[PDB]
Design a protein around this ligand. Sequence first.
Ligand SMILES: [Ca+2]
Length: 208
Amino acid sequence: FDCAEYRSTNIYGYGLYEVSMKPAKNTGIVSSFFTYTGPAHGTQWDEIDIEFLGKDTTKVQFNYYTNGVGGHEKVISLGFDASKGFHTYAFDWQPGYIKWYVDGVLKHTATANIPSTPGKIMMNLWNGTGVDDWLGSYNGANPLYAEYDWVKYTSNGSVFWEPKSYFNPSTWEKADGYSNGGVFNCTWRANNVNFTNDGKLKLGLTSS
Ligand SMILES: [Ca+2]
């Protein structure tokens, strides 16, 4: 299986991160929006996540890692099926808290051991292996898509607006030609990152 990952080339810090998206629906997969920096780049592993488990798109999972330590998973019920339309998901990341919102409504707050290292904005779609309890087993269904209409990052003195109508190499990069291995049971392919004519980033999960 081939999957997809899109990531910023720059780093961003504290502020409001918003994305308008529509995750894919299927057992065994995840569609995400998150920030990330790792020892892979050094720093210290700090990451804030919005993950949609395809097994049940009526919920969304929030989580974070501070210094390689995670386990802050919070599953919230949305009140609607996320895969049926675009909604706005955001997280307000400040030095002493992370606040998550759905369509402008506050849904979760965290104040413990909050990350502080600036990272890249990343979006991916992938199928797991060895985590059937978390994601359900992946059944090989495909192609599957996760779509993103726009991304916005607002700090108090700047705004990063990305409407996703075309590929901009100075700002983003596509993952390609490798697998994360581990529970990621797919290889990242640049060809699986496409832009629709109407201005949406469309990540796909396909066979091969
Ligand atoms: Ca757009």
